[PDB]
Amino acid sequence: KNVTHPYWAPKTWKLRADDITTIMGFRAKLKGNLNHLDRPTPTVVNNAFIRGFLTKEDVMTWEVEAPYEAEYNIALLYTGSNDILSESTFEVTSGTSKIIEKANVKNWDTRPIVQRHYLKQNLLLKKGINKISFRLVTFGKEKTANIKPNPFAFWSIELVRPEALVAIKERAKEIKADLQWMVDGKYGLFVHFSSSSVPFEGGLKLGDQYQKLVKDFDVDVFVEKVLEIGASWVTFTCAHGTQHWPGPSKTIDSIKSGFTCERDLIRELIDGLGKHNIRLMLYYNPNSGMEDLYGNTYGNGDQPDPSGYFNFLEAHFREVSLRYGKDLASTAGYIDDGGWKVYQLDPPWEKFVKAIKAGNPNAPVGFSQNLFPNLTPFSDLVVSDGSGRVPEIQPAFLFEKGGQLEGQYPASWFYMDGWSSRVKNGKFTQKPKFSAEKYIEIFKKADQVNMPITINLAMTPDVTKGHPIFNPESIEIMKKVRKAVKGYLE
Numbered sequence: 001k002n003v004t005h006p007y008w009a010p011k012t013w014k015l016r017a018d019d020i021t022t023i024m025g026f027r028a029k030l031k032g033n034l035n036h037l038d039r040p041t042p043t044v045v046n047n048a049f050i051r052g053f054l055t056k057e058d059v060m061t062w063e064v065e066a067p068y069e070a071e072y073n074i075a076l077l078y079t080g081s082n083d084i085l086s087e088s089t090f091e092v093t094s095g096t097s098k099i100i101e102k103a104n105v106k107n108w109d110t111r112p113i114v115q116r117h118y119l120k121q122n123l124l125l126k127k128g129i130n131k132i133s134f135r136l137v138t139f140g141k142e143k144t145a146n147i148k149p150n151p152f153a154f155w156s157i158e159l160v161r162p163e164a165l166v167a168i169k170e171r172a173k174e175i176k177a178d179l180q181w182m183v184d185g186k187y188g189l190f191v192h193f194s195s196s197s198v199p200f201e202g203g204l205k206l207g208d209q210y211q212k213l214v215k216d217f218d219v220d221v222f223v224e225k226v227l228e229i230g231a232s233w234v235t236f237t238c239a240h241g242t243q244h245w246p247g248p249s250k251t252i253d254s255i256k257s258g259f260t261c262e263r264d265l266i267r268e269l270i271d272g273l274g275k276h277n278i279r280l281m282l283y284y285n286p287n288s289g290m291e292d293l294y295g296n297t298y299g300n301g302d303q304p305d306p307s308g309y310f311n312f313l314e315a316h317f318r319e320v321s322l323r324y325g326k327d328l329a330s331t332a333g334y335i336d337d338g339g340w341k342v343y344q345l346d347p348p349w350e351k352f353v354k355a356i357k358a359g360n361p362n363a364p365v366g367f368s369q370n371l372f373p374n375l376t377p378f379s380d381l382v383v384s385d386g387s388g389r390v391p392e393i394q395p396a397f398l399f400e401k402g403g404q405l406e407g408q409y410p411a412s413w414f415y416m417d418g419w420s421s422r423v424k425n426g427k428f429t430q431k432p433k434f435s436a437e438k439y440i441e442i443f444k445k446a447d448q449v450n451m452p453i454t455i456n457l458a459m460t461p462d463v464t465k466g467h468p469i470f471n472p473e474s475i476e477i478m479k480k481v482r483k484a485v486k487g488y489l490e
């Protein structure tokens with residue numbers, strides 16, 4: 001009863017013998033109870049999990065193509081009730097090769113919710129077409145809003161020759177970013193220049209008058225507020241809701257006109273913030289409005305092909321990174337939905353990372369991993385949407401060898417009042433979530449454990465002298481935060 005548009009349907013997967021190959025569960029043939037949410041169009045569907053592993057007949061089968069006979073290390077990504085996991089046994093088969101292994105219980109209280117399980121024994125694969133099957137052979141049950149169930153939910157399988165993994169990890173280690181400047185700066189400002197946002201003075205949402213509002217953006221007004229709250233960096237939102245880009249881009253323009261600006265606002269933000277040694281990183285969203293820029297990520301025509309889209313992302317990262325060089329701290333401080341959306345295309349993470357660092361070899365890579373474990377060994381920062389909640393403190397063993405987050409460094413991304421400003425009738429509708437004293441404790445804790453915080457204060461897309469661009473109550477709180485954390489202490 002499961003539905004997949006041809007671009008999402010099961011197909012034979014080419015193994016990349018020198019790389020980590022990832023294959024979503026819905027690329028397997030499913031039998032028995034196994035099911036997933038419908039995927040009826042070329043557009044990615046976040047909720048990709050396979051559910052219904054209830055009996056020994058509930059089995060999924062991929063078809064993969066190896067270039068030569070070799071042993072492959074298998075990782076599984078899954079989630080579910082610890083009650084269910086504590087009694088689930090996995091079985092991975094191909095040819096005569098068979099792996100049997102108990103599931104791992106999630107013994108941390110934080111994200112990641114999905115865990116990556118490296119199976120101890122390797123799977124031998126013959127040259128050419130191999131069928132690989134996954135099923136459970138022992139089963140648990142949930143025990144005592146406790147309404148929604150938490151079944152075993154399979155996300156993906158990952159295949160990598162053990163020798164390729166050592167070499168991959170070696171290279172990741174050699175280009176790992178040095179984040180001391182973020183720890184020393186303690187916190188920065190997330191600013192959403194959001195295409196859905198309506199200006200303080202009313203009128204068209206930023207998305208429908210993007211170039212005009214970029215041309216009228218008052219950098220000096222913006223920098224003085226950033227400076228006043230003591231931010232050490234700014235993460236600035238490119239392509240939030242549409243693919244509009246606040247500066248020149250040969251890469252974007254060669255796909256489709258109308259998204260770029262004559263004014264190089266990124267450069268002016270660099271220079272304006274640079275006068276006070278405040279650094280700039282870029283948020284970028286590779287999916288929102290992408291159907292109006294590139295089109296379907298898997299292209300047109302009868303069979304899915306992501307190389308055009310991959311080449312766009314790589315050429316875009318590369319052009320931005322080289323355009324600004326070391327003046328731009330990162331063209332990829334926050335790449336939205338790396339977990340929910342980007343991961344589902346089995347993308348070439350390393351090529352993206354090399355593009356990101358081409359102009360700035362220490363540029364931190366921050367793919368948003370959502371509730372998922374580390375997306376690629378070439379990550380630098382833990383990144384996900386903290387909403388307006390108190391920042392979680394992930395326990396240290398997550399970062400040790402074998403850990404879910406190994407190679408990453410802890411970091412928090414959350415908002416004081418909201419993400420996108422919702423100003424209506426000259427009044428901010430989004431108030432700070434907590435008292436000033438609670439934010440002070442939050443930043444003091446982040447500082448004591450050397451975890452950078454990037455806090456969003458909803459900003460009016462029309463940045464001018466005529467009106468507060470941030471909520472004055474929010475500014476007042478951050479001024480008290482600055483005093484308690486960055487001010488003269490005694």
Ligand SMILES: C[C@@H]1O[C@H](O)[C@@H](O)[C@H](O)[C@@H]1O
Binds near residue numbers: 013014
């Ligand atoms: C054979 C596989 O086909 C898919 O469409 C791609 O997304 C994979 O990266 C690989 O090329």
Ligand SMILES: C[C@@H]1O[C@H](O)[C@@H](O)[C@H](O)[C@@H]1O
Binds near residue numbers: 242336
């Ligand atoms: C730009 C925004 O990014 C988020 O990740 C999405 O979930 C929103 O709906 C919107 O697309």
Ligand SMILES: C[C@@H]1O[C@H](O)[C@@H](O)[C@H](O)[C@@H]1O
Binds near residue numbers: 042299
């Ligand atoms: C067969 C598929 O149908 C869809 O409607 C199209 O958007 C795809 O690109 C492809 O042509």
Ligand SMILES: C[C@@H]1O[C@H](O)[C@@H](O)[C@H](O)[C@@H]1O
Binds near residue numbers: 178181326327362363
């Ligand atoms: C702007 C540059 O960003 C890089 O990521 C940093 O490592 C450098 O110290 C410099 O500040």
Ligand SMILES: C[C@@H]1O[C@H](O)[C@@H](O)[C@H](O)[C@@H]1O
Binds near residue numbers: 336385
């Ligand atoms: C940083 C946040 O990322 C999330 O994925 C989005 O849904 C929010 O709008 C915001 O942009």
Ligand SMILES: [Mg+2]
Binds near residue numbers: 186447449
């Ligand atoms: Mg510190």
